Every structure is written in C-alpha cells, then in structure tokens.
C-alpha cells in the first residue's frame, strides 16, 4: 500500500504531491 | 535490494477558473491488484485499485461521483524512442474508492513494464471520508478538470515525464496522457523488463 502525500499550492491554484512507488524485481537476472 | 524505487513528484492544476478545494496536508492510501485476462491475446493489465484518503483526524464537483462512473484513458508513450500507445476502459465508484479497468497497449508489446505505468494511468476517484470532504481537490475541479503533471525518477535509471488531462467527456471521465521517458538504460530494470507483475 503506497502513500501519496498532498499538500496545496496556493500560487497555481492547485496541489503537489510526492511518494515512492518501490517495483518488485524478480530473481535470477544478476 | 530485490527492488527498483520510482520516486514521484506531481502537481496538478485546475483547467476551469471556477472555485477548487485547496486542501490541509494529508495523503491518499491506495492499494493495487494487477491480473490477466486469460482470453486477452494482446499485451494488457487488469487493475482493480483501492485509495483512499487519510491522515487527518478530525465541492458541486463531489456530487458528480456518488455513483459508478464510467472511465476512458487514453496514453501516448516514448521511452527512448520507443512509441506506444494504451487505451483503458473500466469504471470507478468513488463511494467505496475502487476502480476497475482493463488496459491494452495497441501499438504491440508494451517496450516497458505495465507496473511502471499503473501511476500514470484518475485520483477523483479516492474516498474521501466525511469528515474530510473539504479537502477533495481532484472532485472539486470537475467538471471542467485538471491537469496532472509528473516526473518519475527510477533510481539508477532514466525518468518519465507526464502531462495528463483528467476531466468529464459527458457522463464519463476521461484521462488523456502523453508520456516521454528518457536515459534508461537498455538492459536496466524497465528496458530489460525486469519487474515483477504486481503492485505493493
């Protein structure tokens, strides 16, 4: 379950947001 | 560490000049199921997905998704000179946060992995508990819409930039994407397809 976190931004009359998305690799390619 | 990290930054702007939400901090919680069709010959991703919002203890917009709403997306790609196109149709039901769609890429194999397009590929859709209604940006821009900007760093590897329109085509939402991807590398996690098929 991943987070996204919002926080407003007042000079574009809109939003940011920032987070981490971490893929799983799979095994047996290194 | 077994893993490939994407950090994300994104912003979004309203499209129409009418009142929008500006919301206290806080962050949506979403939960993804990747599948397969069995009978889907054509490279695709099944998703069913759960978000919703948190964090706080505790506009006409909001109105138009108390029900199930049906979803278009539609996304132009370049990654490393690599075109592609996918279309996805599905439905969401903003009352439980839970979408359904089914995406297929119709320019042939997908050149990177599904997983690192499930963010790219409509937040109007998160439940917003009660209590935190007044702070529902995404609903509160529509009909009219928003633009959804993003940059996605793969750590070690190259980066995609998105703009996206997410907004009401008559009864339906619709999110329209161009993405570029650029500096990966060709036999690194996305190029090589190193990833698992999943989403945590």
């Known amino acids: 379950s991943s987070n996204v976190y919002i926080m407003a931004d007042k000079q574009r009359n809109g939003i940011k947001a920032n987070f981490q998305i971490c893929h799983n690799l799979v095994s047996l390619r290194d | 560490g077994g893993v490939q990290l994407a950090y994300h930054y994104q912003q979004n702007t309203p499209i129409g000049d009418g009142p929008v939400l500006l919301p206290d901090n806080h962050y949506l919680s979403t939960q993804t199921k990747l599948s397969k069709d069995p009978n889907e010959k054509r490279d695709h991703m099944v998703l069913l997905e759960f978000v919703t919002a948190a964090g706080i203890t505790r506009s006409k917009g909001e109105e138009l998704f108390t029900g199930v709403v049906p979803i278009l997306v539609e996304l132009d ?32 194999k997908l050149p990177v992995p599904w997983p690192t397009l499930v963010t790219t590929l409509v937040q109007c859709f998160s439940r917003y508990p009660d209590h935190m209604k007044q702070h529902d940006f995404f609903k509160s821009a529509m009909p009219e819409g928003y633009i959804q900007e993003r940059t996605i760093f793969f750590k070690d590897d190259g980066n995609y930039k998105t703009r996206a329109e997410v907004k009401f085509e008559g009864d339906t939402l619709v999110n329209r994407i161009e993405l570029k991807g650029i500096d990966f590398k060709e036999d690194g996690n996305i190029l090589g397809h190193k990833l698992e098929y999943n989403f945590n």
Do not use: P, Q, R
């Open chain 2, 77 to 108: 790609g370049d990654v490393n000179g690599h075109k592609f196109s996918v279309s996805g149709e599905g439905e969401g039901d903003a009352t439980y946060g839970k979408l359904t769609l089914k995406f297929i890429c119709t320019t042939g």
